[PDB]
Amino acid sequence: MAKAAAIGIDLGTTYSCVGVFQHGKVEIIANDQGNRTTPSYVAFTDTERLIGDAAKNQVALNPQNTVFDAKRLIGRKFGDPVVQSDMKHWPFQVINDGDKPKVQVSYKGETKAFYPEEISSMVLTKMKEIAEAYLGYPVTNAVITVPAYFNDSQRQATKDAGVIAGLNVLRIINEPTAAAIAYGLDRTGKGERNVLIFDLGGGTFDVSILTIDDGIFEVKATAGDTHLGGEDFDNRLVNHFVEEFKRKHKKDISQNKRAVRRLRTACERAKRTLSSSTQASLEIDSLFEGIDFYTSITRARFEELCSDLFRSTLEPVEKALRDAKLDKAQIHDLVLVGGSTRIPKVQKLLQDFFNGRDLNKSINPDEAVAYGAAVQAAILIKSTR
Ligand SMILES: Nc1ncnc2c1nc(Cl)n2[C@@H]1O[C@H](CO)[C@@H](O)[C@H]1O
């Protein structure tokens, strides 16, 4: 029953996703708000702890006690220059406990501090409960994914997050490996198969090159930008619309925190529409000083607004190829991961770089990692019997 069942969890920087492989198919499990992905957010309020959508939904109202980006801290020492640099950009406090970072917040009127694995365990507990509500029984066996570049300390702290969350961690597998498994790229028989995974998420960009030799995965190269993602594109739309409001009304809205956040969420939404329509409409009632902001933008203008950022995704692709010592024509498969890979200009830039090549994109790119993890979790639990 429950003991013969296992889930796959993509514990993402900005979003997490849970899948289950049963009756010959993967089911990506929708949360209680009907969302197939859940924000990797934990909010501490005057009455409760919120996880996911409810936590992300109140971020503007409670920024000091709304934790996100715990994955950027997990398995790292406080003195790590990555931690010291990132800390300057978070509204929540990060403290030092014997060279280990802890996120410090106010919860039920009291000061509490949590290890990154404790924050990540609350996100994992949510994914576990989402799977349990779907299945109708508790599932505790899980495969959890991590970036291919995670070292041993980061892998161990992710496993620890799983244990705190009440999960039996069958295996910690690499995100690009789970994505290649999702497409069955490890079951093409014999011979070395070179796979490039192009993963453009909400806050990070990862390029991975893998060689699959008779089911055995080998990481040949990892490249990318840990601070490039979908939210930078939301921000480029924000600056455009702030400048358009100034042209129409001779008013600068950039200092009105509420106006900027309402514009930001509307921009994120319009950006998604621009992936399947050639225009998107913004409909903001009383954006600033009672002024409605009913406007639109073409996909052509959005592409211009992010042109440099879209083009910058090709440098880590080239870098990964040189590190792996492979030319473009030596790559057998191209895989899209991360919601931002739905952007047509991004697909076009990658396909053109690979000389008109087809892309593996039939699986929801924000779901491919959990999909593969769910497949692996099923194989692993079956071998355990
Ligand atoms: N249809 C889409 N067109 C463009 N961007 C998208 C789309 N869907 C998602 Cl999710 N994202 C973005 O992916 C990230 C999460 O993986 C977020 O930045 C989200 O906006």
Side-chain angles (χ1 to χ4, degrees), residues 37-60 62-76 78-80:
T37 67
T38 296
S40 299
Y41 279 64
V42 182
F44 301 87
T45 86
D46 62 325
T47 59
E48 61 197 318
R49 199 187 64 191
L50 308 160
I51 306 155
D53 292 309
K56 187 159 176 176
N57 290 344
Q58 58 77 85
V59 71
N62 182 33
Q64 302 178 281
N65 311 304
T66 305
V67 182
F68 59 93
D69 275 359
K71 184 167 176 179
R72 299 188 180 275
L73 291 166
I74 208 161
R76 296 179 187 278
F78 181 85
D80 187 324

Short mmCIF file of all heavy atoms in Angstrom, two decimals, residues 37-80, unseen atoms left out:
data_model
loop_
_atom_site.label_atom_id
_atom_site.label_comp_id
_atom_site.label_asym_id
_atom_site.label_seq_id
_atom_site.Cartn_x
_atom_site.Cartn_y
_atom_site.Cartn_z
N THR A 37 2.61 23.40 -9.31
CA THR A 37 3.87 23.79 -8.65
C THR A 37 3.50 24.67 -7.46
O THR A 37 2.45 25.32 -7.47
CB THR A 37 4.86 24.47 -9.60
OG1 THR A 37 4.30 25.73 -9.99
CG2 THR A 37 5.22 23.60 -10.82
N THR A 38 4.32 24.65 -6.41
CA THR A 38 4.06 25.35 -5.16
C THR A 38 5.26 26.24 -4.85
O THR A 38 6.38 25.74 -4.86
CB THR A 38 3.79 24.29 -4.04
OG1 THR A 38 2.60 23.55 -4.34
CG2 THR A 38 3.67 24.90 -2.63
N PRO A 39 5.05 27.55 -4.58
CA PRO A 39 6.19 28.43 -4.24
C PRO A 39 7.01 27.89 -3.06
O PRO A 39 6.42 27.41 -2.10
CB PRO A 39 5.49 29.76 -3.89
CG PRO A 39 4.19 29.71 -4.65
CD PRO A 39 3.77 28.29 -4.52
N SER A 40 8.36 27.94 -3.15
CA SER A 40 9.28 27.47 -2.08
C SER A 40 9.42 28.58 -1.01
O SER A 40 10.53 29.07 -0.72
CB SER A 40 10.63 27.04 -2.66
OG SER A 40 10.47 25.97 -3.58
N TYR A 41 8.25 28.98 -0.43
CA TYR A 41 8.10 30.07 0.52
C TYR A 41 7.52 29.59 1.83
O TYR A 41 6.64 28.74 1.84
CB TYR A 41 7.15 31.17 -0.04
CG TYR A 41 7.79 32.15 -1.01
CD1 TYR A 41 8.30 31.72 -2.24
CD2 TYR A 41 7.78 33.52 -0.75
CE1 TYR A 41 8.87 32.62 -3.14
CE2 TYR A 41 8.33 34.43 -1.65
CZ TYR A 41 8.87 33.97 -2.85
OH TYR A 41 9.44 34.87 -3.71
N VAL A 42 8.02 30.15 2.93
CA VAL A 42 7.53 29.85 4.26
C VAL A 42 7.34 31.20 4.95
O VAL A 42 8.31 31.93 5.13
CB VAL A 42 8.45 28.92 5.09
CG1 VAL A 42 7.81 28.63 6.47
CG2 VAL A 42 8.76 27.61 4.36
N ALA A 43 6.10 31.51 5.36
CA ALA A 43 5.80 32.75 6.08
C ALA A 43 5.48 32.47 7.54
O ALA A 43 4.84 31.47 7.86
CB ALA A 43 4.65 33.50 5.42
N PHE A 44 5.97 33.34 8.42
CA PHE A 44 5.72 33.28 9.85
C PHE A 44 4.90 34.50 10.20
O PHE A 44 5.31 35.62 9.90
CB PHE A 44 7.02 33.19 10.66
CG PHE A 44 7.85 31.97 10.29
CD1 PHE A 44 8.76 32.01 9.24
CD2 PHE A 44 7.70 30.77 11.00
CE1 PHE A 44 9.52 30.88 8.90
CE2 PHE A 44 8.48 29.66 10.67
CZ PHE A 44 9.37 29.71 9.61
N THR A 45 3.70 34.28 10.72
CA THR A 45 2.79 35.39 11.03
C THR A 45 2.52 35.44 12.53
O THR A 45 3.10 34.67 13.31
CB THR A 45 1.51 35.33 10.12
OG1 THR A 45 0.54 34.48 10.73
CG2 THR A 45 1.80 34.85 8.68
N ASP A 46 1.62 36.35 12.94
CA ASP A 46 1.19 36.55 14.32
C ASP A 46 0.35 35.37 14.82
O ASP A 46 0.19 35.23 16.02
CB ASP A 46 0.42 37.88 14.46
CG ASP A 46 -0.88 37.97 13.66
OD1 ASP A 46 -0.93 37.40 12.53
OD2 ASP A 46 -1.83 38.62 14.14
N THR A 47 -0.18 34.52 13.91
CA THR A 47 -1.02 33.36 14.28
C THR A 47 -0.58 32.02 13.72
O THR A 47 -0.93 30.98 14.27
CB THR A 47 -2.49 33.59 13.86
OG1 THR A 47 -2.55 33.80 12.44
CG2 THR A 47 -3.15 34.73 14.59
N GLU A 48 0.10 32.01 12.58
CA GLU A 48 0.42 30.74 11.92
C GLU A 48 1.64 30.78 11.05
O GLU A 48 2.22 31.83 10.78
CB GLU A 48 -0.78 30.28 11.04
CG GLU A 48 -1.12 31.27 9.93
CD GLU A 48 -2.47 31.17 9.26
OE1 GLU A 48 -2.93 30.03 8.98
OE2 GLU A 48 -3.05 32.23 8.96
N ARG A 49 2.00 29.59 10.58
CA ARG A 49 3.06 29.36 9.65
C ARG A 49 2.36 29.03 8.34
O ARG A 49 1.49 28.17 8.31
CB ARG A 49 3.91 28.19 10.14
CG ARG A 49 5.29 28.13 9.51
CD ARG A 49 5.99 26.86 9.91
NE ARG A 49 5.28 25.70 9.38
CZ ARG A 49 5.52 24.44 9.73
NH1 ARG A 49 6.46 24.16 10.62
NH2 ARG A 49 4.82 23.46 9.18
N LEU A 50 2.71 29.76 7.26
CA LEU A 50 2.15 29.50 5.92
C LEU A 50 3.23 28.94 5.00
O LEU A 50 4.39 29.33 5.10
CB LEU A 50 1.53 30.76 5.29
CG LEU A 50 0.49 31.52 6.14
CD1 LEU A 50 0.34 32.95 5.64
CD2 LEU A 50 -0.85 30.78 6.17
N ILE A 51 2.85 28.02 4.12
CA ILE A 51 3.79 27.41 3.18
C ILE A 51 3.18 27.45 1.77
O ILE A 51 2.00 27.14 1.59
CB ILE A 51 4.18 25.96 3.63
CG1 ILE A 51 4.72 25.93 5.10
CG2 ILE A 51 5.22 25.35 2.65
CD1 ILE A 51 4.59 24.62 5.82
N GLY A 52 3.98 27.87 0.80
CA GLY A 52 3.57 27.86 -0.60
C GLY A 52 2.84 29.10 -1.04
O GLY A 52 3.33 30.22 -0.81
N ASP A 53 1.69 28.89 -1.72
CA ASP A 53 0.86 29.95 -2.28
C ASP A 53 0.44 30.97 -1.24
O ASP A 53 0.70 32.15 -1.45
CB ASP A 53 -0.36 29.37 -3.04
CG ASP A 53 0.05 28.64 -4.32
OD1 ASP A 53 0.81 29.22 -5.12
OD2 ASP A 53 -0.40 27.48 -4.51
N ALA A 54 -0.11 30.53 -0.09
CA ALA A 54 -0.54 31.44 0.99
C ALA A 54 0.65 32.27 1.52
O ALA A 54 0.47 33.43 1.87
CB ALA A 54 -1.19 30.65 2.12
N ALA A 55 1.86 31.68 1.55
CA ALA A 55 3.07 32.37 1.99
C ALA A 55 3.49 33.42 0.96
O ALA A 55 3.80 34.55 1.34
CB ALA A 55 4.19 31.38 2.23
N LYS A 56 3.50 33.05 -0.35
CA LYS A 56 3.88 33.98 -1.42
C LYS A 56 2.87 35.12 -1.53
O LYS A 56 3.27 36.27 -1.72
CB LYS A 56 4.08 33.28 -2.78
CG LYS A 56 4.63 34.23 -3.85
CD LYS A 56 5.31 33.51 -5.00
CE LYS A 56 5.77 34.46 -6.06
NZ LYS A 56 6.50 33.75 -7.13
N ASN A 57 1.57 34.81 -1.38
CA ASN A 57 0.46 35.77 -1.47
C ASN A 57 0.52 36.92 -0.46
O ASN A 57 -0.06 37.98 -0.74
CB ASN A 57 -0.89 35.05 -1.38
CG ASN A 57 -1.24 34.21 -2.60
OD1 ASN A 57 -0.65 34.34 -3.68
ND2 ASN A 57 -2.20 33.31 -2.44
N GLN A 58 1.18 36.74 0.70
CA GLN A 58 1.26 37.81 1.72
C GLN A 58 2.68 38.38 1.90
O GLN A 58 2.94 39.03 2.91
CB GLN A 58 0.64 37.36 3.08
CG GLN A 58 1.26 36.11 3.73
CD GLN A 58 2.58 36.36 4.40
OE1 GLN A 58 2.64 36.77 5.56
NE2 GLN A 58 3.67 36.11 3.69
N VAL A 59 3.59 38.12 0.94
CA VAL A 59 5.00 38.55 0.99
C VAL A 59 5.15 40.09 1.15
O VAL A 59 6.01 40.53 1.91
CB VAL A 59 5.85 37.98 -0.19
CG1 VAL A 59 5.51 38.63 -1.53
CG2 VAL A 59 7.35 38.09 0.09
N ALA A 60 4.30 40.89 0.47
CA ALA A 60 4.37 42.35 0.51
C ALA A 60 4.03 42.90 1.88
O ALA A 60 4.67 43.85 2.34
CB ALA A 60 3.45 42.97 -0.54
N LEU A 61 3.03 42.28 2.53
CA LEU A 61 2.52 42.65 3.85
C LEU A 61 3.46 42.26 5.01
O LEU A 61 3.46 42.91 6.05
CB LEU A 61 1.14 42.01 4.05
CG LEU A 61 0.02 42.47 3.10
N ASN A 62 4.25 41.19 4.83
CA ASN A 62 5.11 40.67 5.89
C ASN A 62 6.49 40.28 5.31
O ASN A 62 6.87 39.12 5.39
CB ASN A 62 4.37 39.46 6.51
CG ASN A 62 5.01 38.76 7.67
OD1 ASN A 62 5.70 39.36 8.51
ND2 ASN A 62 4.76 37.47 7.74
N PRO A 63 7.27 41.23 4.72
CA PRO A 63 8.54 40.83 4.07
C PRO A 63 9.64 40.33 5.00
O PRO A 63 10.42 39.49 4.59
CB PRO A 63 8.96 42.09 3.30
CG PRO A 63 8.34 43.23 4.07
CD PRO A 63 7.01 42.68 4.54
N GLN A 64 9.71 40.84 6.24
CA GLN A 64 10.77 40.41 7.17
C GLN A 64 10.59 38.98 7.63
O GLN A 64 11.57 38.32 7.98
CB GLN A 64 10.83 41.34 8.41
CG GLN A 64 11.06 42.82 8.08
CD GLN A 64 11.06 43.67 9.32
OE1 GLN A 64 10.01 44.02 9.88
NE2 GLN A 64 12.25 44.03 9.78
N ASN A 65 9.35 38.47 7.64
CA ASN A 65 9.10 37.12 8.15
C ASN A 65 8.67 36.12 7.07
O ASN A 65 8.25 35.00 7.40
CB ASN A 65 8.10 37.19 9.31
CG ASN A 65 8.51 38.24 10.30
OD1 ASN A 65 9.63 38.21 10.83
ND2 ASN A 65 7.65 39.23 10.52
N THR A 66 8.85 36.49 5.79
CA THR A 66 8.54 35.60 4.67
C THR A 66 9.84 35.09 4.07
O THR A 66 10.56 35.85 3.43
CB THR A 66 7.61 36.28 3.65
OG1 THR A 66 6.46 36.75 4.34
CG2 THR A 66 7.19 35.32 2.55
N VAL A 67 10.15 33.82 4.32
CA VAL A 67 11.39 33.19 3.91
C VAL A 67 11.24 32.51 2.55
O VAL A 67 10.23 31.87 2.29
CB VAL A 67 11.93 32.20 5.00
CG1 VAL A 67 13.26 31.57 4.58
CG2 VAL A 67 12.07 32.91 6.34
N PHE A 68 12.22 32.74 1.67
CA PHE A 68 12.34 32.12 0.34
C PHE A 68 13.87 31.94 0.12
O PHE A 68 14.65 32.33 0.99
CB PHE A 68 11.68 33.02 -0.73
CG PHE A 68 12.24 34.42 -0.86
CD1 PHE A 68 13.26 34.71 -1.76
CD2 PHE A 68 11.74 35.46 -0.08
CE1 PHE A 68 13.79 36.00 -1.86
CE2 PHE A 68 12.26 36.76 -0.18
CZ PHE A 68 13.29 37.02 -1.08
N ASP A 69 14.29 31.37 -1.02
CA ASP A 69 15.72 31.20 -1.37
C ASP A 69 16.53 30.40 -0.35
O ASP A 69 17.75 30.55 -0.31
CB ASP A 69 16.41 32.58 -1.58
CG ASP A 69 16.30 33.22 -2.96
OD1 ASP A 69 15.67 32.61 -3.86
OD2 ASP A 69 16.84 34.34 -3.13
N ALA A 70 15.89 29.54 0.47
CA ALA A 70 16.63 28.74 1.46
C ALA A 70 17.64 27.81 0.78
O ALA A 70 18.67 27.48 1.37
CB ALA A 70 15.68 27.92 2.31
N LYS A 71 17.33 27.41 -0.47
CA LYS A 71 18.17 26.54 -1.31
C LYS A 71 19.54 27.21 -1.61
O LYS A 71 20.53 26.50 -1.83
CB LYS A 71 17.41 26.20 -2.61
CG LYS A 71 18.12 25.21 -3.53
CD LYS A 71 17.18 24.70 -4.62
CE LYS A 71 17.91 23.80 -5.57
NZ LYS A 71 16.98 23.27 -6.62
N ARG A 72 19.60 28.56 -1.58
CA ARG A 72 20.85 29.32 -1.80
C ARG A 72 21.75 29.24 -0.57
O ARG A 72 22.96 29.51 -0.67
CB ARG A 72 20.57 30.80 -2.18
CG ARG A 72 19.74 30.99 -3.48
CD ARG A 72 19.69 32.48 -3.88
NE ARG A 72 18.92 32.71 -5.11
CZ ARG A 72 19.42 32.61 -6.34
NH1 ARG A 72 20.70 32.29 -6.51
NH2 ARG A 72 18.65 32.80 -7.40
N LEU A 73 21.16 28.89 0.58
CA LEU A 73 21.87 28.79 1.86
C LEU A 73 22.19 27.36 2.25
O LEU A 73 23.17 27.15 2.94
CB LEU A 73 21.01 29.40 2.98
CG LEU A 73 20.81 30.91 3.00
CD1 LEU A 73 19.67 31.27 3.96
CD2 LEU A 73 22.08 31.63 3.44
N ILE A 74 21.32 26.39 1.87
CA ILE A 74 21.40 25.00 2.28
C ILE A 74 22.80 24.39 2.03
O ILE A 74 23.36 24.53 0.95
CB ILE A 74 20.22 24.14 1.68
CG1 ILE A 74 19.91 22.93 2.60
CG2 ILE A 74 20.44 23.74 0.20
CD1 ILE A 74 18.48 22.26 2.40
N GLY A 75 23.35 23.79 3.08
CA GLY A 75 24.65 23.11 3.04
C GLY A 75 25.85 24.04 3.02
O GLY A 75 26.98 23.57 2.87
N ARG A 76 25.63 25.36 3.16
CA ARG A 76 26.73 26.32 3.14
C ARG A 76 27.10 26.84 4.51
O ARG A 76 26.27 26.84 5.42
CB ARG A 76 26.43 27.51 2.20
CG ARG A 76 26.28 27.14 0.74
CD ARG A 76 25.96 28.36 -0.11
NE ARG A 76 25.64 28.02 -1.50
CZ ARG A 76 26.54 27.78 -2.45
NH1 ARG A 76 27.84 27.82 -2.17
NH2 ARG A 76 26.16 27.47 -3.68
N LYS A 77 28.35 27.30 4.66
CA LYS A 77 28.85 27.92 5.89
C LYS A 77 28.47 29.41 5.83
O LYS A 77 28.33 29.95 4.74
CB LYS A 77 30.38 27.78 5.99
CG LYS A 77 30.90 26.35 6.08
CD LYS A 77 32.43 26.32 6.15
CE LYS A 77 32.96 24.93 6.38
N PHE A 78 28.30 30.07 6.99
CA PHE A 78 27.95 31.49 7.05
C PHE A 78 28.98 32.38 6.33
O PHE A 78 28.59 33.31 5.63
CB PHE A 78 27.77 31.94 8.51
CG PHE A 78 27.39 33.39 8.69
CD1 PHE A 78 26.05 33.78 8.62
CD2 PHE A 78 28.35 34.35 8.97
CE1 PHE A 78 25.70 35.13 8.78
CE2 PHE A 78 27.99 35.69 9.18
CZ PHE A 78 26.66 36.06 9.08
N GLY A 79 30.26 32.08 6.51
CA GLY A 79 31.39 32.80 5.92
C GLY A 79 31.55 32.63 4.42
O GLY A 79 32.36 33.34 3.81
N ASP A 80 30.81 31.68 3.81
CA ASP A 80 30.84 31.43 2.36
C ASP A 80 30.53 32.75 1.62
O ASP A 80 29.51 33.38 1.95
CB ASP A 80 29.81 30.34 1.99
CG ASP A 80 29.80 29.83 0.56
OD1 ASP A 80 30.06 30.63 -0.37
OD2 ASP A 80 29.50 28.63 0.36
#
